[PDB]
Every structure is written in C-alpha cells, then in structure tokens.
Amino acid sequence: VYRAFDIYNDKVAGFAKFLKTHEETIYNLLPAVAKQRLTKYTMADLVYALRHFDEGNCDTLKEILVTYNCCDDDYFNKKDWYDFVENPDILRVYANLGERVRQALLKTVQFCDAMRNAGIVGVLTLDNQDLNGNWYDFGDFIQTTPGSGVPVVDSYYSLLMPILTLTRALTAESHVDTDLTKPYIKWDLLKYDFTEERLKLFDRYFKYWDQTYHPNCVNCLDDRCILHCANFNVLFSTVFPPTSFGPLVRKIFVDGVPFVVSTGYHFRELGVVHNQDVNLHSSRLSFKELLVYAADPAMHAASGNLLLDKRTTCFSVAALTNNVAFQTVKPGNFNKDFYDFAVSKGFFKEGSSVELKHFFFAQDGNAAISDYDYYRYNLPTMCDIRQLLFVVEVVDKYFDCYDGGCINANQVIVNNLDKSAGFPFNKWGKARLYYDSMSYEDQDALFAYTKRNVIPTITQMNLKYAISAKNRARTVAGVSICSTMTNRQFHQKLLKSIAATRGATVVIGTSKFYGGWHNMLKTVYSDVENPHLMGWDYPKCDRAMPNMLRIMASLVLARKHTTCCSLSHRFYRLANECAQVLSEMVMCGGSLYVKPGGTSSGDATTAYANSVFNICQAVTANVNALLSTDGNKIADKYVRNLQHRLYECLYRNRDVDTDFVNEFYAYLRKHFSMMILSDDAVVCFNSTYASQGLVASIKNFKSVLYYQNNVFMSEAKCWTETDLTKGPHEFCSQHTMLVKQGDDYVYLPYPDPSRILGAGCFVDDIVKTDGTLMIERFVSLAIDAYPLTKHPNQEYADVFHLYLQYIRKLHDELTTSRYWEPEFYEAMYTPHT
Amino acid sequence: KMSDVKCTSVVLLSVLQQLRVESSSKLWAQCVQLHNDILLAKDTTEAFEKMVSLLSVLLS
Amino acid sequence: DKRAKVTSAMQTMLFTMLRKLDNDALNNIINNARDGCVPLNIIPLTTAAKLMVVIPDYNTYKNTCDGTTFTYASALWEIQQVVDADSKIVQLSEISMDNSPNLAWPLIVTALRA
RNA sequence: AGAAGCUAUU
RNA sequence: AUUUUAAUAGCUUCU
Ligand SMILES: [Zn+2]
Ligand SMILES: [Zn+2]
After folding, report:
1. Half-sphere exposure of A182 (CA within 13 A, CB side)
2. Which of A326, A369, A410, C95 could form a disulfide with A365, with the two C-beta atoms 3.0–4.6 Å apart?
3. Beta strand pairing status for A591-594 and A316-319?
4. Cα torsion through A806, A808, A809, A810, rounded to 10
5. Residue A608 and residue A286: Cα distance in Å, rounded?
6. Distance in angstroms (rounded) separating the CA atoms of residues A521 and A811
7. What residue stretches are annotated with the RdRp Nsp7 cofactor domain (chain B)?
C-alpha cells in the first residue's frame, strides 16, 4: 500500500507518503485500544488528503467521503464540487466527518491516561489510529515505574489542528449534555467570561498538551505565547453564543448624568480584556474624553432600534435610522470626440486584435450590502501552531533590515488632510479639523491612553467609482480618525523605512520609471541556478484572510518596539488593532453589523500587512514541500540534513534554533527569490529543485491556500514562465518586454491596450469631457502607453500614436511641441535621471 | 458594430438616469441588468435587441 | 473657533443620544450583572422598543412575518407598518403570491414590542 | 538643483 | 455620503 505516514528516524523525517510492503507485554499493559478489524484508511490518510489537496488526484478523499455517507458518488459528477466559493455546500459535506473526528480525540485522551497509569513512554502518531479512533500499534514503547508514564503528543495534535476547524469537530459541545439529538444549550444573555468553560474544554480534549494555556491572553509572556493561546481560543470560541462577544459596557456618571460607555472587550482570540483607566464618576469633559466617547459604538447601539436583516448572514446589532438606505452606481460618461477620432483614424475595425473590454458598470440599490455579504467566505480557522511559530521566525528574518519604533505628534507625516474621518466625525468635518483642533500634547495623551485601554471604533462602507472588465461594484472600508492617528504614531516610522528601501524582497515604494522595472527584474533574478518564473494572485484577499494570520502580521510589524514599549503596552496596542480593524462594528447604509474578520482596506498598514501575509504563505508552501518528500529519495546530503533539522525544529524543539533559522533563510534566498508587493508576487526559482521537490511549486501554494486560506486557486489566475528574456507574464497589471535601448537591452513595462483605450474613452464626470483643460490626463495616459510603440503588433503600437495626434488636436484647439514628440516620453524610461 | 452598440447603450443609460428613472427601483434594476448584459455580450444580434428594449424604455 | 464648534457638536450628540435611551429597562438589565458589566450586543435585544425587518423575497416573509404579530428573540412583536424598497406603504393584505411581482422587494417591516 | 501648495494619472 | 499606501506629470509661490 502507498499510504500517509508521520516519521522521525535517525535518517529520515517528515509527514509524507510511503510504501508498506516485548510488544506482547506492552499490549498486556495497554476501550481506546484495538483488539479486531481496522478501517482501510487511518487518521493520517485523512489528514494528508485534506492538507495536500490536489484536484484530479483526490481518489483517497473521495473514497473516505463516500464510505462514511458524507455525500453520494454523484456529488462528484458535478464540476467544481470541491470549490469553497463556487460550491459552499462542500462545507456542510465536510462537517459530516466532524463528530467522528471528535470521537477520535476523546479516545486519544483515554489512551494517554492508560499510559500514565502503566509507566509507558512513547510518541503518538496519526497513522496508528484508525478512523474509528482505535489505537493499534505500540512499537517503540518502553517501560517505566507505573503512575509515571509520559506521552509525547505535539506532532499528533499539531498536525490535526486544521482539520478540527475544517470539519467543525466541536459542534456537539454546543448541545445539552453534549449530544447532537439533544437541544441546544440556552446560555444566559449576560454571561461573557467563559474562562472556566475554556479550561474545561482544554482539559477534556488537550489534557496532554505540555505547554501552558492562558484563557485570557492579557496574561501571556511574549508574542509567541500570544499566538499559541490565541490559536486555542480561536478553536474554543466557536461553541459560545455570538452575542457574548465584542465590547463590554457599563454605566458611568458625568455631572450626575448616567452615560453608557465601553469598559472592556471580549475577543474570540484574545479572551477578556479590561480597561485600566476607568473613573466611575467624572466631573467635566475636555476635548480628549469627548472624542473617545463619541467614537465609542456603545451608546450608538444602545440608543438604536433592534434590527433583523435577512439579506445578510452577518450578525446585526442595530439600525440608527428609521429607514434603510440604498446607494446605487451610475454609468460612466462617454467621450464622443475621442470615439470619433479613433473611428476616423481607422480603429475599431471588426476583427481588430484591440477590443474595448473595460467599462463602467451600473448597480441597483442593493449593491453595498451585496458586496458586504462577501465576508461569508471568512471562516474560523485553526492553524498548525508549531508550523506557525517556525514560519513566523523565518518571516521576521525578512524584516531585519528596517528601522522602526514610536514617534511623536510632531514627527507625523500625513499626505491628505481633506480625506474623511468616518462615523460619527464625518458629520462635523474632514480630517483637517481634527488634526488642527488637537494640540501635540492631546495627541500624545491619546496615544498614552491607547497604550492602556481599548477604544472600539465604527468603520463605514463606501462605494468606489472605478473602471473594470468585470461586473462588480467595489466597496472600500473607511476607518475612524482616532484609530488612524494612533496607528500612524505607532507604525509610520517602520512604514516609511520600508517605502524608502531599494533592492529588497518588498518592492513597495519603488518606481517603475527611469529603469526601475529593469532594476527590479534584475534584482529578483539574483543568481538562481536554473531560473523559472512563477506568479499568482489571491482570489479574495481581505474577505478570506484567517484572523490568526492577521494577528501574526500585526505582531511581526510591532516587533520593532523592543526598546520603547513594555509587553503590557504592546499587548494593549495589539488589542486596539484587533478591536478596531479586525472584528468591529461596520456601518453599512444606516445600520450596524458585526465584521466576521479578514481585513479593512482603509487601514493604515494594509499593503504592508498583505506583504507579510504573502511571505508567510510562500514560506509555508516551501516548508510543506520540503517536509513531505521521501528522504531516502533525496540525493544531496545538505538538503537531507536541512529536512531533518527542519522537522526537529518544528515538532521536537520548543526553543528557537537561531542558527537553523539563518540557514533556512539563506536556502530560501538562494533557491526561491521573491519580489512582493501587497498580495502580488513574482518568484524566480530553481527548476531542478522544484522538479525534485526541494522547493515549492504552484501546486504546493494551491494546497496551502486550500487548507489555510479557505479558498481554491484556479490555474486561470496562476502563471509560469520558462524563458527569462520574456519577463513576468503579469505583475501589477503590467506586461514585460525586452526592448533595445541604445546599445543595451532593457526590460520595459507596457499595459493592456484595451485598458488605456477605455480610460481615454470613458470617464466618471461630465466636465472631464467638457473642460478641454485636461491635456495632462492624456499626457499621463500617453506616458503609460508609450512602451506599446515597441510591440511587434502594429495595432498595439498605434495607440500611442493616436494619443499623440489627439493631444495635437487639443493643443491646436487651445493654441508644447514636446507633447507630440516621442523624445519627451522616451526620456521617461531611460536610466539616467 | 459591437463597440457602437456598447457605446450607445452607455449613452442611453446615462440619458435614462437624467430622466430620473433611478428613483424607480424595478425600472432602474431592469435597465442595469440590460446594460450590463449588453456590455458583457459578444454577439451583436441580441445586443441590438437589448438596445431596442432600452430605447423603448427611454421613449416610455 | 472650530475646536469650540466641534466640542459643542460632540456634547450635543452625546446628550441627544442620551435623551432617547429607555433607562428603566437598561437599569433592570445592568443591575443583574455580576459587576455591572454587560455585553453591548444584548442591549438592543432586551431593551429596544422598535424592530426593523428586511425581507428579500416571499419565502422569507412567510417564514418570518406571517400575520400581524410574530415571536422573535423571546418576545412578541405587533406589526406596525410595511414599506417597499421604493419607500411606499404596502398594505398587509397585498402580500400574497399573485401580487408578489407588483411589489418592489425587499420589504421593510416596522414592529413594536408588546 | 531644491522645498511647500493645487490638480491629474496609473 | 466618497478609505490606505506608492510612484509620476503639469501649474503656482519661494531661498
Ligand atoms: Zn499565553
Ligand atoms: Zn513603541
């Protein structure tokens, strides 16, 4: 048989697929133990199938599903049955395994108890447990004094972690007497603590976890302890009422008037957090406290009506207005003159390789809520925690060249002060008012306040007019001003440092002009032995991002404060971020809803957090590719030792092996070179190693997204390139070509001709067609379209010429020459500046 | 011909919006679906028929 | 002068929000907590005196708001008004199968606690 | 060759 | 009622 095994010998190590072509006294010493019959597939088979999912090869998964009446065979006859987005029903199908999984967990504990009462020491593996929960192999177990046995179960539980949330294993815990036929437990409305239930669940299922668990993460030791305890809390928060989460409120007295304020917060991940700077009776309200109380969602909800919205599956809180709101989107404006000129110049002939794809799409009054109901793809996810710890160390090794820390209110740089401040401030003015009316002392005091308390904020949902080749309204999430000010003071130093560095893995801030594209491509090519190019996109970035990876991103970003913030200060900062941009109240057309998680795009650190997320997923794919290969098959001694030490540092070494972290970082930099911007990535990798399996391919990335990001990756959004002279197929919506400039050869980025043509043809405001003082618009479009003159296809190369003749038309109507000369635009891609 | 149909659909939808049709929910929703299907369509026959329907909506 | 103007704006908004707050039920629900701290989500559930329901289609309506009084969240609600997506009053007797196409969905129901 | 203000484009 | 970050062009003031 060719089955999944979890192995650690002196020679080989890993979770992979292998061929399978004293114990009496041990068995005599040891209801969770088999006699009898043994389910063809073990728990290792299921774990490997769900963790290494590949379409067109999931025969074992199909057999496991149709064996246990999770679905029928005809369920697999329909296409995209395995897709999370196109076929949500698969989730329900997966849940049909849940209870069985849960049963296995309980039996494991029994087994371990037996060992602790017989003085037996041994390492638990998933492949010794049948799908019914029966342990049936005691090979290496030795004897010790009875009553002092010890089981090692870190690999078992760590590998099993994702499947617990994938199959919804703890559903039966939400019923009376933990019985699926029994009714649901009727928790009190006022209960919010749940600490003792968390401890009871931990002792029921994870009794033999060696590490210490903190139900409230405010008691943790560092950021790694925060990650570990937050993972456990993510698993345990799925069995508690959804009304028990969010801000905890209280009644205070200001000048004897009773106000309702927020004094704490109950997180799903971080447990219960209480504000320290609380005064039950207050005298007068200055600017700072008035701001904090007005941004508070507590009173807004407390003074609103009960709301029941059946259009959405998001938890609803209240309706501020008495009538629901409807925001539509209008069609674009048509530039008749440009259309006439293009038609006269011989364009738009039927069959031309250049066709108008990008338009402006109108929407009806139910567009904002229709786009808001995309967080339904955000599912609670439990992560392999040993893998997450090693990967977070490797991922921070990518950020060890930047400068960061805390700045003051006189060191803060804000680009645009005419932007909006969010609810409830949007009612009284722009961000200029709130930056101008606060002195630097007030802002410093507000920062000092956020370092010991939690201020919950409300975001707004806005519809953005845009151009696309897809029929979809787009919503952006605007954040309140207070969150932005303290995030700026907390993060701007590091963000500016990242944006002011050249030749690095993250290329945010690097211009594409004046040879920038050539420099970036040459930096990413590095000196990889057998280079191939790979690229990918994330299907739904902000909607379908697990909350654990967002917390990891925030912790990696905040690690720069080693000398300026104590650990309580850093934890309260992280709690503020989680309560402000992760799971907060969302105002969507006059009503308040609860955000499941993911990402708010109007955040101050969105692109950099996305870059951390990209590096984490890539490193995870590399680890899962290296660890799942037959060690005997590998022919290089260095790579085999690297794999063995990677397994040991993952599941056998609680402390951090810094030297091996450096070694793995060097291996990745040599053989897997990345250029990354937000969720966009281009990789130059060693072909021979990827073919042998020593580095990740695109299928490893697809499997990682399948079991971690809750999305499916279609080949229609992934690209591979073999010839390096042709650059990346796509990167930030640009194609690449190797033109001849002077006596050198240089890479040039060019856009899609349809996009530039549509941008010229369609606008969003009527005056954009009437002012005729928009020559700069066409000049910018021509600066973008200039590289197309080097394309072999003539219809492509003719778009820039058409733009030049239209600019001439406009200038001759108004009336320099440079704007119709090709030298002005040729100088925009020359290295010398 | 296709591009002329799409551009004329854009112009006609803009005119209808100028005619305060956006304040009738069913009319505007039907117009939005018709316009989007025109924009994503490929054959000019049904696109012409949809243009005719939108023009009849405008004249009504 | 703006600082003073936005200070007054915040003060007013706070006190007006206060003036709409049904304080007796809030006192009743707060005084039962272990230390006077309650979750925010349950305050409109157990204190609000008006309910708004948004209904996309007829199946959801007949499974949610059948008649003139319905039970939701362990309370009884008397239907006060029904309005269409165009914000025009819809009579209760019109919400049948035959008149479903004429109505402009989704429907907004306003109910009062009873 | 620089800073600051405004608009536009990707 | 219209968010975050980056790059670029044009116009004005000014050592
Ligand atoms: Zn801890
Ligand atoms: Zn700091």
Report:
1. 12
2. A326
3. antiparallel
4. 90
5. 35
6. 38
7. 1-60
Nearest 5°: the CA angle A523, A529, A532 is 70
Strands A585-587, A458-464: pairing kind: parallel
Residue type, A334: F
Helix (H) or strand (E) holding A143: strand A142-143
Chain B residues touching C84 at Cβ < 8 A: 25
Q: Which residues contact A373 (CB under 8 A, 6 or more apart)?
A: A311, A312, A313, A314
Q: Provide the residue type at A537 as one letter.
A: D
Å: A786 CA to D2 C1':
29
Task: Give the minimum alpha-carbon distance from B9 to chain A in angstroms, rounded to a whole number.
Answer: 10
Chain C residues 20-79 within an 8 A CB cutoff of chain A: 20-21, 23, 26-27, 29-30, 32-33, 36-48, 50-56, 60, 64, 72-73
Question: Is A588 annotated among the ligand-binding residues?
Answer: no
Q: Environment class of residue A35 by beta-carbon count within 10 Å: exposed (0-12), middle (13-18) or buried (19+)?
A: exposed
A305 and C45 in contact by Cβ < 8 A?
no
Region of residue A287 (phi > 0: left; psi between -120 and 50: alpha; otherwise: beta)? alpha
Which ligand places an atom closest to the C-alpha of A222?
A: 1
Please report which ligand is nearest the Cα atom of A490.
2
Q: Where are the domains of chain A?
A: 2-186, 336-362+751-829
Place of tokens 């700069």: A776
For the CA of A414 and the C1' of E11, the distance in angstroms is: 23
d(CA A775, C1' D8) / Å: 9
Query: How far from the centroid of its chain's Cα atoms is residue A665's Cα?
Result: 22
- The verdict on whether A353 is a catalytic residue reads no
Is A678 one of the catalytic residues?
yes
Q: To one decimal place, what's the resolution in Å?
A: 2.9
In this structure, is the CB of residue A768 within 7 Å of any atom belonging to strand D? yes
How is residue C36 written in tokens? 């006077």
Residue C95 structural domain: 25-114
Amino acid (1-letter code) at residue A549: L
Is residue C103, in this structure, part of any structural domain at all?
yes
Query: CB neighbours (10 Å) of residue A820?
Result: 18
Structure tokens at A570: 């850093």
DSSP codes of every residue in A513-580? TTTHHHHHHHHHHTT-SSEEEEEE--SSTTTT--HHHHHHHHHHHHTT-TTT--HHHHHHHHHHHIII
Neighbours of A609 (CB within 10 A): 24
CB atoms B24 and C85 under 8 Å: no
- Domain CATH for C102: 3.30.70.3540
Query: Considering A296, A680, A784, A798, which one is annotated as catalytic?
Result: A680
Q: What token pair was written down for A349? A: 């002939």
The torsion angle over the Cα atoms of residues A224, A228, A229 and A234, rounded to 10 degrees, is: 130
Asked if A294 and C3 come within 8 Å (Cβ–Cβ), the reply is: no
With tokens 């362990």, the residue in question is C74
CA quadruple A315, A319, A324, A328: dihedral positive or negative?
Answer: negative
C37, part of any domain: yes
Residue C63 domain flag: yes
- Protein-contacted bases of chain E (C-beta within 7 A): 1-10
10 Å Cβ neighbour count for C63?
10
CB atoms within 10 A of CB A615: 25
Known catalytic residue: A680? yes
Task: Kindly report the bases of strand D lying within 7 A of a protein C-beta atom.
Answer: 6-10
| Domains of chain B, residue spans | 2-60
Decide: CB of A303 under 7 A of nucleic strand E: no
Q: Is the CB of A511 under 7 A from strand D?
A: no
Give the closest-approach CA distance of A297 to chain C in angstroms.
Answer: 9
CA–C1' nearest nucleotide, residue A604: E4
Reading the block at residue A736, the tokens are 């690449």
* A214 CB-near residues (< 8 Å, 6+ apart): A220, A225, A229, A271
Residues of C with Cβ-Cβ distance to A317 under 8 angstroms: 40-41, 44
CA atoms within 13 A on the CB side of A341: 18
